[PDB]
Amino acid sequence: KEPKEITFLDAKKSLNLNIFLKQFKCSNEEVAAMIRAGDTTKFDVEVLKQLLKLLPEKHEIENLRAFTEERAKLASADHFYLLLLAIPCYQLRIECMLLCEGAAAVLDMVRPKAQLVLAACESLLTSRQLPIFCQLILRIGNFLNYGSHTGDADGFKISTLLKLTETKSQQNRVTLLHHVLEEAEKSHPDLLQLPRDLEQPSQAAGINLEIIRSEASSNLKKLLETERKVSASVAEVQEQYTERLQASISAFRALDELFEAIEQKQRELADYLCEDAQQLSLEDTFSTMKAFRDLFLRALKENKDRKEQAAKAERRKQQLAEE
Amino acid sequence: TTALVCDNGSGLVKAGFAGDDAPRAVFPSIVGRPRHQGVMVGMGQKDSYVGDEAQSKRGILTLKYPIEHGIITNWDDMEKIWHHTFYNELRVAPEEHPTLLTEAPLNPKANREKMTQIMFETFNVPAMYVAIQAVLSLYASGRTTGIVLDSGDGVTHNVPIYEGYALPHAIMRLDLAGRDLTDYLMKILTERGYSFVTTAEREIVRDIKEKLCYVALDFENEMATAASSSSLEKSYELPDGQVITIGNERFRCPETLFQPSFIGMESAGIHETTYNSIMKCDIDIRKDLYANNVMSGGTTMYPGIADRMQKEITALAPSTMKIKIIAPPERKYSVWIGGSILASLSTFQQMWITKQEYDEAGPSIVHRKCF
Amino acid sequence: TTALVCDNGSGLVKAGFAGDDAPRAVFPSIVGRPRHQGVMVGMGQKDSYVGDEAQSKRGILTLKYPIEHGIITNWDDMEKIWHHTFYNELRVAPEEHPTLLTEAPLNPKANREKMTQIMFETFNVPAMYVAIQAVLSLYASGRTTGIVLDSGDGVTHNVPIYEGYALPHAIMRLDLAGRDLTDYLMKILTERGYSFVTTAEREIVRDIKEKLCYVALDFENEMATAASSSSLEKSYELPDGQVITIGNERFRCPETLFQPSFIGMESAGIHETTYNSIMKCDIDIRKDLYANNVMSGGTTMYPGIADRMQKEITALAPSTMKIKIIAPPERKYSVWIGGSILASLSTFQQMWITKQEYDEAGPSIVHRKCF
Amino acid sequence: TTALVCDNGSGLVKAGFAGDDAPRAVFPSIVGRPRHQGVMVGMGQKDSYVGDEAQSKRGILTLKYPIEHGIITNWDDMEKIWHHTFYNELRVAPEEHPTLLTEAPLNPKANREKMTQIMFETFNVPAMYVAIQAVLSLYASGRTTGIVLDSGDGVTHNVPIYEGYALPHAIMRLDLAGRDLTDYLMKILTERGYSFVTTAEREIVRDIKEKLCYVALDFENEMATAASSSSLEKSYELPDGQVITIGNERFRCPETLFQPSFIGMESAGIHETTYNSIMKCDIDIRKDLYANNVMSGGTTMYPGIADRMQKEITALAPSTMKIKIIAPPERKYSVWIGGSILASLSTFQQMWITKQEYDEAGPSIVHRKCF
């Protein structure tokens, strides 16, 4: 029978470790070898999170080191912790594998989005059809506000583009933006190539850049602390992990250079819109231009449906007149 | 003592011993009664056929499903399923082996009462346990936290379980699954002229849905391509020898999973059900559930479902957190596999609901013991 | 000009003008070819007789039905039906008249496609429309909501329409109607010795079924009375002068409509089909569906079917609901009557299918225009 | 000139003329779109339905609330609500009557911006004012000091006012009211087997909540009484004639108001919110707030809520203070009554916002003028 498993743990933690161990579909010696070799193929964020959440405790390590009987009498959990205690700097190796996989995940997460945000700022500073379209909106608004204090102006802010769909006609179906695009479909079609410049401003950030920047800075700080602990550790851990740490710190330093470039382009976009930089001129401008591009394409689609319905109504009227 | 793991599924019953990788007996939950006249004398003409015996002789049998939408409707038919899978399939006495059973979330309590009463009184056991199918699917994945989209034959539910704790309020349940897809496929197969009215024809169209149907990545582009060219048209050979051909209906049938208004079931899509179940949880645990989307059940065995599901969740969720769909190839038996994972463990011996606890507390200690 | 309403039903074709009350040409849809050898020279010996002329000379003609269970089988035969009702019966030019046509629900699409192709290419029209028969039966009823049990010669379908809106998920089609009742009557008259094998004998048995058969309110007490006494027995004179005498088969033959297991069909009765169509709808609208049962079609022309239908639905429904079966005397021609109602509206004139739409979209406008 | 009072709450709209007691037009704030596609004719069917007409045809209509938790989501649906309550219910022009409007405290200001823009551009008025519902509830109370718990359909807010001076830092808003109680009741009726998944069924469960539910004086004693005996069970007839019977769910539904951990909300009960809003004030004025606890809104119309509120406050407060709950029977209509009281004031006639003020200051004077 042998029920005396001499397990120093309780039931729940040994239960969760027996849940955790059985998904590897192999012996715990292979698990201890993969910890010692630093192999990150089978070790994603969640597995190493569960492994750090099922760490051995101080009295558990003391009872394992005071165990003087036969090691086959132990359970698989206590034998796995003895294999884990056999690895020198095992928690350091687990933290290196977790931080390397998490650093690769956060870098592949943030860096194309940060390149999208930088390309969005570069296309918002330099846009081709945007001054001609803003001059047309300015001339139409100066005709519309003739005789009021808002009229006879030489410009407007970027929040006016959100307010274009607020003004509607007598029918309350064709807006100001819909009428301007119905006129621009006939006269100046190059303004319909406005989203091709705004396609890198399309989809915005969609995120808070301070959240990913604080996560990137905290990950870089954790990588620096980890590289300092590996530099205090043995040379096997150094030859295992120092090149990966150096590549991760170098890529996050390139990410911080990219974030400083986004700050410089944010100040340039604040000076572009003639607004102070103390207000949010970064995420509000991305959300404003994303909503402007979505309303622009929706005005194109609704004017297309309006012209198709008018042509189908003309065809139905001609077919009723012929019959 | 080897325990018995038995998922009494809505569609397919999967049974076998403790600790095995594969379930021993996998058979559909049907009861076949004869509807024509038996004229031959002797030779063992049964008044009811159970399981694969009903499946083989399905041309002359009215087929009855005892479970509808995860709820055991016909109790005597379910007793015939239980007695067949104990005595004919596994050939084991119930009185010498403990038994693990599965239950859908948001089940009626009297269903659990009658299940405990039948599994302690009709077939006497030393012990039994009832477990949630999503918990066994997450244990089959091997992770303690994560959200399981469990899709059987009658019910489809999104259950997020954080660190072994199943959140009760965040469980979302929609009764739209593969039998409804089979009936919708039987409806839309009359567009080309293939009429199917019988219960055996439901099994034939179910085999067609298992073999030929697949999830489209974009429904409008696939519909435009199937309207344009006949590349997606596939021929199936029926058991009588006739050959049918279907086109766009290979992807129009699982599109009811994403667009439930096809059958008039006015509700959100299963990706939208998953996103609303995620948004029912705390914001602290949402990042864990975004990267741990486990899909279980044979209904999720279409070979297009993971990329479309990741695309729909990535459209629904913001671009902050990592979206990762967990799709094991062994997902169809995974609940049974998770039950086998829960079978051989050392700390499960205190968690067994004994005969003495059943006599002490009725069939009602399963409510206070199991979640 | 004047629109034309032509119900191309499964057994009988009813043609006439829009805005008229009674249909102008009611004639059965059969094609009569000569099966014996002709020996007299000349005298206008046609190779195909259509309709009433085929009905007259039916002793020397093999008779073919072009429509089988709402599906046009032989398109050349249906071309001859349409040419006969356009040029011989109604005697109109099809190029100066809009045309309404009727169709069963859940019908294969290519039948509607070839109907559009023949009615735009062979008999070219200024305009045409294809309408669902239950919608026309509810328009002949005049009420905005209700449920129509329309049972013709090939298709019995249950369609509920609430506030003018069709609910397609609850549309229930079963191909069991009066031709199959005629074939079952031809099976059961061989018990008394009266053999009937030919198509002319099929029309004789159809005439017997129309003249003598009736729906029993209770099947068991009527069967016990017919087995007890010969009071329900009635005699019929055949066209050679032979007189047959029948008993219980006057009500055993329509009891296949309430029990499809007599001909071996696995599906339940039309009252159970109606109850499943009601229970497939939403819980709000069922009270209006219980009191607005609109029975149309010639198969509902038995003089016991409304009381039996009310009794079976009142047994099926919860008892606190008002069950009302609307059985007008003109329910045989109600499809044509509702077609003449719908065709005579100025609002319907924008809803036509024109030649320009056909040349633009192929014969694919009829799927997107018509429901 | 007769002023208008239009209380546009989240679930219902109570509109009418000022200087009146009973609200003239009380109707739910729902917008019904046709759920299923169907054109037909229908003698000019409406493309959307407002309130009682949407309630009448609710089985086939998708119902949309334009206001969620006091915040207008769909502004065009709110414009249709405004057009129906101006032109159809009251049948008055907006440009010949001043119109007082209500608002929950701690509203985001863009709702007030678009409300001012719609009320001056497309539904143009001579004058309008945007007010606080708790101030009008204290006006219907008749006193000047006191704290008001106003609980509508989405917002339950506690506002203390001493001598006409509302303290803005002590205003406490919790988004938990009768719609969330209806959603929790729809969640908990599935324990007894009754399923309600559609928005039309939300009206049935809301009627169950309005008729049958009540506040328990003690939750645990009532739970033990319902577990022991079925004397607290009450029956309810469904519109399809079915009868349901419910026990503890009569008082489990309002206990979300005192314990938001049932639905997983981490905030405390409204008694603790009331005690924290009183203790956020100055210590000298708290005795008047304990003696003038005013309850308004239709969510506080359960017949046990004043006794339970007095019990919980007297448990929370020091015992020397006199605890008094002001619970009028007209607390449902009290916001409209106080709106008529405020619009009838001659001193309030200098406080209106003119059309010339809207033209001069843009849509920005309503932040400076209104609180």
Ligand SMILES: Nc1ncnc2c1ncn2[C@@H]1O[C@H](COP(=O)(O)OP(=O)(O)O)[C@@H](O)[C@H]1O
């Ligand atoms: N490859 C497949 N494609 C489509 N459907 C499948 C496939 N495999 C299984 N199914 C269906 O999915 C359902 C899932 O079965 P399962 O959940 O294991 O049993 P149950 O549904 O009875 O609980 C089955 O009823 C089956 O009909």
Ligand SMILES: Nc1ncnc2c1ncn2[C@@H]1O[C@H](COP(=O)(O)OP(=O)(O)O)[C@@H](O)[C@H]1O
């Ligand atoms: N008096 C009657 N009693 C019972 N059944 C009848 C009677 N008259 C006709 N029928 C049945 O109705 C059928 C005719 O239906 P019909 O109105 O032509 O439908 P459809 O137009 O859809 O073909 C015939 O086949 C016949 O069997």
Ligand SMILES: Nc1ncnc2c1ncn2[C@@H]1O[C@H](COP(=O)(O)OP(=O)(O)O)[C@@H](O)[C@H]1O
């Ligand atoms: N008898 C009742 N029982 C419970 N709640 C009610 C009752 N009557 C109305 N209500 C609730 O009151 C709310 C309606 O608020 P109402 O007093 O009409 O103000 P408003 O018009 O500003 O919404 C609804 O949410 C409804 O749930």
Ligand SMILES: [Mg+2]
């Ligand atoms: Mg299963």
Ligand SMILES: [Mg+2]
């Ligand atoms: Mg017909």
Ligand SMILES: [Mg+2]
């Ligand atoms: Mg109101």
